[PDB]
Design a protein. Structure first.
Lengths: 103, 60, 103, 103, 103, 60, 103, 103, 60, 103
C-alpha cells in the first residue's frame, strides 16, 4: 500500500510510470481494496527525487503543487518517515495553514 | 551552456504549477441534470399510463 | 417493491428505462399488487445519480421537481436509508413545509 | 474588497486558487456584500505575474483576453495603482477604444 | 392581494403551482373577497422569471400572450412597480394600442 | 531544450485566448420560455376553474 | 460587406467577437441590408488564422466543418482572393463534389 | 444497403451527415425499398469512430445508448464483421440479456 | 572548464527522461465521445422523420 | 526498412533529422508500406552515437528512455546485430523484465 497505483478500478492499467530516479507515494480513501464496488473520491500523492532536497505533493481538491524544501534530507525516498509527507488520512486537505507552501 | 540548463530548469518549474483546477463540481452538476431530466421524463410516462388504465402502474 | 415499475395494469410494458447510472425508487398506494382490479390513484417517485449529490423527487398531485442537495451522500443510491427519500406512504404530499424545496 | 472571491453566494466555496506567483484583482457590481439577496450580473477581473511585464484582464460581456504589456512595471502587483487595471466600475466594458488590445 | 390564487370559489384548491423561479401576479374584479356569493367575470395575470428580461401577461377576453421585453429590468419580480405590469383595473383589455405587443 | 520551452509558451498563449463567448442571452431566453409556458398553463387552470364555479377564483 | 456581422436584425448586438489573430468572412442572402423587413434564410461563413495554412468554412444547411489545407498561403487573410473561400452566392451548398472535404 | 439513409420516404432528404471520421451502419424492416407504400416501423443503428475502441448502437423501441467497448478492434469500421454490430434482423430488441450493456 | 562540461552532460541526461506519458487513451475517449454524440443526434433525426412519414426512412 | 522515416502517411515530410554522428533504427507494425490506407498503431525506435557505449530505445506505449550501456561495443551502429536493439516485432513492450533498465 501507499505506492503508485498500477491499475484503475475499471481493470485498465494505470498506464503511467515514474521518472528514472524519483520516489512516489500515493494514498486514497480505501487503500488498495480493488473490490470493484467502491469509489475513491479523493487522493493524496507526493513525489521526490532520491537525490533532491525537495518533496512535492498535491491532493484531489486543491490546485498548485505544494513543496517543503528542507535541505536536511538529500538521499531519502518518500517512503522514509523523516520526509513529512502526506500519509494515509488528510487526503483532501483543501487548505494549508503553516506546514507547506507554494503561494 | 550551464546557464541555458539553469533557465530550462527555471521554466520547467514555472510551467509545472499553473493552478490546475479541481473538476469535481463541474461534473456532479451534469450528473444532477441527468437525474432531474430522467425524473421529469418518468413523470410523463406515469401520467400517460394512468390515462390508459385509470390507475398508476403497480410497483416492480 | 419500491423500484421502477416494469408493466402497467393493462398488461402493457411500462416501456421506460432509466439513464446509465441513475438510481430510481417508486412507490404507490397498493404496492406491486397487480390484482387486475385495483386502482393506484397516487404515486411518489424519486431519482438520484449514483455519483450525484442531489436526490430529485415528485408526487402525483404536485407540480415542480423537489430536491434536497446534501453534499454528504455522494456515492449512495436511493435504496439507502440515509438519503431521506419519500418512502411508502406520504404518497400525495400536495404541500411541503420545511424539508425539501424547489421554489 | 477587490480580491479573488473565496465563496459564491450559494455558500459553496469559490473553489479556485491562483498560481504560485500571480497577483489577481476581481471586481463586481455589489462588491463583497454577501447579503444572500443580491445578484451580481457582471464582473471585471485582471491578473499579472509579479515578475511579468504583462497584465491580463477580462470582463463579463466580452470575449478574448485583453492585455497591456508595458515593460515599465516588472515587479509590481495588480494592487498597485500604476498598472492601469480595470478597477471598480467599468465592469461590463463590452467595447475597448484605445487603451488595451488583443485583436 | 394581487398574487396567485390558492383556492377557487367552490372551496377546491386552485391546484396549480408556479415554476421554480418565476414571479406571478394575478388580478380580478373583486380581489380576494371569497364571499361565496360573488362572480369574478374577468382576470388579468402576468408572469416573469426573476432572472428574465421579459414579462408575460394575458387577460380574460383576449387571445395570445403579450410581452414587453425591456432589457432594463433583469433581477426584478412582477411585484415591483418598474415592470409596467397590468395591475388592478384594466382587467379585460380586449385591445392593445401601443404599449405591449405579440402580433 | 530552451527552444522547446519557447514554443510551449507560444502555444499556451494561443490556447488561452480562443474567443470565449458570453453565455448570457442563451440562458435568459430559456428563462423567458419557462415563464411564458407557465403563463399559458395558468390560463388553462383559470378557465377550468371558471367552468367550475361560473367565476374566476378570488385573489390570494 | 462580407465581414462578421455586428448586430442581428432584432437590433441586438451579434454579441460575438473573433479570436486574437483569426480572419473571418461572412456572407448571407441579402448582404448588409438591415431593412427590418427581410429574412436571411441562409449563411456562408469561413475563418482562417492569419498564420495558419488552413481555411475553415461552413454553411447554413450543412453539418461538419469543411477545410482546404493548402500549404501555399500562410500569411494571408480570408479577404484575399487566392484563398478559394466561399464568397457571395453558393450560400447553401448542402453538398460538395470535389473542392473541399472533411469526411 | 445497411448504410445511413440519404432520403426519407416523403422524398425529403434525410438531412443529416455523420462526423468527420465515424462509421455508421443503419438497418430497418424493409431495407432500401423506397416503394412509396411501405412503413418501416423499426430501426437498428450503430456507429463507431474508425480510430475508436467502442461501437455504439441503439434501436427503435429502447432508451439509452448501448456500447460494447472491446479494445481488440481499433482501426475497423462498423462494416467489418468482427465488430459484433446489430445487423439486419433483431431490429427492435427492446431487451438485452448478456451481450451489450450501458446500465 | 571541463567540470562545467561534465555537469552540462549530467543535466542533459536528466532532462531527457522525465517520464513522458502515452497519449493513447486520452484521445480514444474523445473519439468515442464524438461517435456517441453523433448516434444520439441521429436518433433525433430518425424519430423526426418517422413523425413526418409514419415510417422510418429506407436504408441508403 | 528499419531506418528513420522520411515522410508520414499524410504525405508531409517526417521533418526531423538526426544528430551529426548518431545511428537511428526505427520499426513499426506495417514496415515501410505507405499504402495510404493502413494505420501504424505502435512504434519501436532506438538510437546510439557511433562512438558511444550506450544504446537508447523507447516504444509507443511506454514512458522513460531505456538504455543498455555495454562497454563492449564502442564503434558500432544500431544496424549491427551485436547491439541487442529492439528489432521488428516486440513493438509495444509496455513492460521490461530483465534485459534493459532505466528505473
Amino acid at each position: 500500500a501507499g505506492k503508485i497505483p498500477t491499475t484503475t478500478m475499471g481493470g485498465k492499467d494505470f498506464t503511467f510510470k515514474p521518472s528514472t530516479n524519483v520516489s512516489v507515494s500515493y494514498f486514497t480513501t480505501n487503500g488498495a481494496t480493488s473490490t470493484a464496488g467502491t469509489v475513491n473520491t479523493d487522493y493524496a500523492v507526493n513525489t521526490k527525487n532520491s537525490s533532491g532536497n525537495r518533496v512535492f505533493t498535491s491532493t484531489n481538491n486543491t490546485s498548485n503543487i505544494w513543496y517543503i524544501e528542507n535541505d536536511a534530507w538529500k538521499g531519502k525516498a518518500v517512503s522514509d518517515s523523516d520526509v513529512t509527507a502526506l500519509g494515509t488520512g488528510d487526503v483532501g486537505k483543501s487548505d494549508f495553514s503553516g506546514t507547506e507552501w507554494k503561494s | 551552456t550551464l546557464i541555458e540548463l539553469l533557465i530550462v530548469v527555471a521554466i520547467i518549474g514555472i510551467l509545472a504549477a499553473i493552478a490546475i483546477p479541481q473538476f469535481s463540481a463541474y461534473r456532479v452538476k451534469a450528473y444532477n441534470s441527468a437525474a432531474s431530466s430522467d425524473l421529469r421524463n418518468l413523470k410523463t410516462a406515469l401520467e400517460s399510463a394512468f390515462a390508459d388504465d385509470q390507475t398508476y402502474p403497480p410497483e416492480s
